RNA sequence: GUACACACCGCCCGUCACACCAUGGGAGUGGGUUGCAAAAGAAGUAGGUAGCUUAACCUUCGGGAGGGCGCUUACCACUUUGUGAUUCAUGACUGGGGUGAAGUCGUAACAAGGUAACCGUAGGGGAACCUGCGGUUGGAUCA
RNA sequence: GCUAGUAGGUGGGGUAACGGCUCACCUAGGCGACGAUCCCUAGCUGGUCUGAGAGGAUGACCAGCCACACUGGAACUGAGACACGGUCCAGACUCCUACGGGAGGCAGCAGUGGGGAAUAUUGCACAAUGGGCGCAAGCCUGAUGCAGCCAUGCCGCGUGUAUGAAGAAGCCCUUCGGGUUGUAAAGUACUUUCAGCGGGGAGGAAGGGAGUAAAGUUAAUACCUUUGCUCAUUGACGUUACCCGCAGAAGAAGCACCGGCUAACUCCGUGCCAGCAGCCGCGGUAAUACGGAGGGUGCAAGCGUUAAUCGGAAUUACUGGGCGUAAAGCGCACGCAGGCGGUUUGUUAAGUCAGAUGUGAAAUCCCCGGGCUCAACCUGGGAACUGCAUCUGAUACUGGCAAGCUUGAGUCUCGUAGAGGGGGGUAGAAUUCCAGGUGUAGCGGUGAAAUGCGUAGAGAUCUGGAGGAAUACCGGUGGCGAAGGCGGCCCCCUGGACGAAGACUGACGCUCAGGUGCGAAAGCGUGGGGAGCAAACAGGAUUAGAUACCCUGGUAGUCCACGCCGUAAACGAUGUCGACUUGGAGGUUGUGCGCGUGGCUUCCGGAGCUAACGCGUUAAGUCGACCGCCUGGGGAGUACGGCCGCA
RNA sequence: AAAAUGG
């Protein structure tokens, strides 16, 4: 582009949208579980990945992934969610924070305990 | 149409050097002759000669060293579309001083070194390496 | 359903207010069941919802989760053939259904003889039955 | 030549069926903001003066000057009415889009893909498309 | 598009003051594509973060400025307010009431509830600095000085140090030989920061209050004032820093990670399950990728994760990118604003350049230092603040002004070639139809058929007539045109190009957003025309079906006039103008004297360029001027809105 | 002449 054209119309940047809109520029957001269920991953993966529909305090209802093996989350459970999408799960853009609020830490976990809210054995 | 005669001169030199031409002739002008003097004094061209009166023509004798053109790169800096003026402290250094920058000062056209010695800034006409 | 979300919150608060109050949504029926130590207890709670929580509600009898079982035994055939060009879909299985011991649930028997159904397809047959059994065969 | 590379038993298009998601339209419905045209007139300030009243000054000793109060006018907040604009939410139903899963119907393109393909336009047809007119080569063939 | 106190003027009034500030009158102005008006968002700055920089992002703490103080509004007092802890009115809330009426405003400090992922004590002292009042003493000060809580960050230090083979047990692994943990631990010899206990101990303190003295002042050795002199006296922090002594390694390490990216690998368990995951992917029975263990790697009172900004991203490219085929040249042209502009002299000094002067708060950043045991932290000086204004200079270049010149551009004189355009006329061939003659059973069509046509005489052949459309051959990588396009011959009207030799004008130019014109085919409107061809439609075939391809028919349309539409793979998928840079073989059209010299065009190819293919003096090489356009694939050139259209 | 298809 020529300088004269750039004077008339300057170089234009990009908006860049967030992959975690429901968080609304917050590290975590509290919400209540509206439905805890399992879902199948997209090809080429096969499993029954655990997810939960959650209505956030901000008023957004989103799906969150329940990481770790085993959870005590039922409908009407208050959980803290953080950013983090799941590749093979379509529409899950958030993760539940284990070991916070009503969410419990993973049992029999000896490695990466802080990531699953487990206290030092 | 023809709008930048200086860039044309620089092109003729460049295209001549690439075509291994002994000399390059062009329509003459006071500014062209001034730059030709600076090139000659800095040892980028062999000699220049202005001939004619009604329509003077400037012939520049190009110099090739070991079968290689002395002028490895000649580029216009300030141009009609975008004029470039520099203060004495901002004068450019071509090829870390190994090249020259033809600058038009209030005391005439000269190299960047000469202008920096005279404590004069001006319009950066071209870079000649 | 606007008050349903409020009802959730109301039940939460009610549970905090009274330990004996127990709120639990039966998964099978999909209906929330309110437990109390007395009729009057539950009545007061519901009245509280209507007023304090401003949640209009109407009590009802908890739905019952029923199941089905074949009362008779009969040998049957299931044939599925869908070939009209290129790769098709053929599958025939002769399965005998008999009333199992009450509480024994499903007792599938692979009595395939002559390897008519290849071993690889056998688990699928069983799995397909299981899924179909989970779905209602009567009601 | 090629859009094929477990390599034509390749690749691959659209309708239809089902599920899900975002979104457009939709008799309308509920909010936010706002334009215009009016109405309204608390308090305050300024202007005028039915009446009422008055420490300091003047005085012929009666009054006078001036002031205050009240009243009145102007300006103006709340508030009110009508009619528009804009924005957001929601709406029976409906349009197309995307994502599913070894569904159904064909086989349109890629080889000359078996009628070369494609572009614009028009008409027709369950669907991919087909046909006319003009255009392009980003088609093979030639012994 | 916007605006009636609106723009200006005049007079009057008003303010501390200028002013439509206000009013009356007069004039009709003012603003805006250099973005007005309107909509959305937002306190601004010194600075902060990131970045090599240019930029990008940001404006917490600190400092300056502005705005607000329950909401809406108004004034009073005063030097200053339209006033956080003033007044009045209205409103919503809370509270009191004898029901008549009252009262109040934490966006001062602390604190409470609520909201939230999440942010502290209803502390102490005016000892110091600063402020209000006072003669002063003093008093007031949630300013401020300090203390509390919090790993929130930053910085410094510690959790021991040497020795120690027994290469112990024990763990893991192993080819069962052994290896690794690992000198690691025991064992031995030391040190004790810090914590703890004890005991010393600064500095922040200046002043103020008593006297006492001299001087000044005065009538006065009065009083007062000033400066010395002397004596008691003022620390919230506070159990201060710091120093010293005592006992004893005692009291003090965790977090993440090891498939690649990425420094760090095995065993076991599980078996497309459970699970993992930033990306690529991993898991279906020999998982360094899941989970556990052993071992290692990295960091450390932290370590991870999430959110967020910049960077990497030359991925909006000013620095610093592209557009033949990857995304991207408007279908073509004219042209206003705008951008840019040959050559010469003089003039001016706008830009530009130089120097000077004022300013650009302090802090911060940077450099050189100083001070806390060091560091973080604090501080002196300097630098920088890249800017702006003004003055004095320089004048090359750019600009302005003036005069020129001819080389760009243009005019004229003459000739040439051309399917360039518009209008009118005409010729020959062929098809179809109509009438008649001759003649007799087929014709036509296909891969093969059939529909169809024919004894009501077809087809074939001959003669006459009617009508429409298109112009064989010439004919060509030929020509003409801005593009779209343009083809018999003749005339009429008309545009452009090129060449030769002179003259004339004197930069009169180039590009061009918006605007305007032209713009294949199809299509649309009105009125004509209609031979042939042919969407649609019909029948016959083909086929599993055949809404096709093939056959027999056939309407709109194709044609003309006028109007509309405004699009095509409108393509060289290559914007326009100018200059420059090896060659060869051709075509077409001028011109000079076989050899020159112009215009246009085709193929091939060198350097160079290109991702490659290719392009290659007709550039996609080398440069300059201006414009258009692109920023992953879908969604989508679609929706919505606007404009245009009869549709 | 006809000559479809193949998670
Ligand atoms: K997998
Ligand atoms: K819909
Ligand atoms: K609506
Ligand atoms: K086709
Ligand atoms: K078509
Ligand atoms: K005004
Ligand atoms: K006036
Ligand atoms: K800034
Ligand atoms: K306010
Ligand atoms: K005062
Ligand atoms: K004080
Ligand atoms: K650039
Ligand atoms: K112009
Ligand atoms: K000049
Ligand atoms: K017809
Ligand atoms: K252009
Ligand atoms: Mg809607
Ligand atoms: Mg009033
Ligand atoms: Mg096909
Ligand atoms: Mg085809
Ligand atoms: Mg093709
Ligand atoms: Mg058709
Ligand atoms: Mg704001
Ligand atoms: Mg950078
Ligand atoms: Mg006053
Ligand atoms: Mg006050
Ligand atoms: Mg207050
Ligand atoms: Mg507070
Ligand atoms: Mg809360
Ligand atoms: Mg007090
Ligand atoms: Mg490695
Ligand atoms: Mg294993
Ligand atoms: Mg990040
Ligand atoms: Mg960048
Ligand atoms: Mg690029
Ligand atoms: Mg393409
Ligand atoms: Mg392209
Ligand atoms: Mg073009
Ligand atoms: Mg033009
Ligand atoms: Mg100047
Ligand atoms: Mg400063
Ligand atoms: Mg000049
Ligand atoms: Mg002519
Ligand atoms: Mg031409
Ligand atoms: Mg047409
Ligand atoms: Mg017509
Ligand atoms: Mg026909
Ligand atoms: Mg036909
Ligand atoms: Mg187009
Ligand atoms: Mg064309
Ligand atoms: Mg194009
Ligand atoms: Mg070539
Ligand atoms: Mg459209």
PDB file of C-alpha atoms (C1' of nucleotides) in Angstrom, chain E residues 27 101 233 309 590 606 643:
ATOM      1  C1'   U E  27     -28.277  41.285   8.136  1.00  0.00           C
ATOM      2  C1'   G E 101     -44.989  17.115  62.621  1.00  0.00           C
ATOM      3  C1'   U E 233      12.602  19.318  79.815  1.00  0.00           C
ATOM      4  C1'   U E 309      -1.227  -7.393  28.054  1.00  0.00           C
ATOM      5  C1'   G E 590       4.365   4.160 -43.579  1.00  0.00           C
ATOM      6  C1'   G E 606      19.932 -13.998 -22.624  1.00  0.00           C
ATOM      7  C1'   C E 643     -29.036   3.054  -2.721  1.00  0.00           C
TER       8        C E 643
END
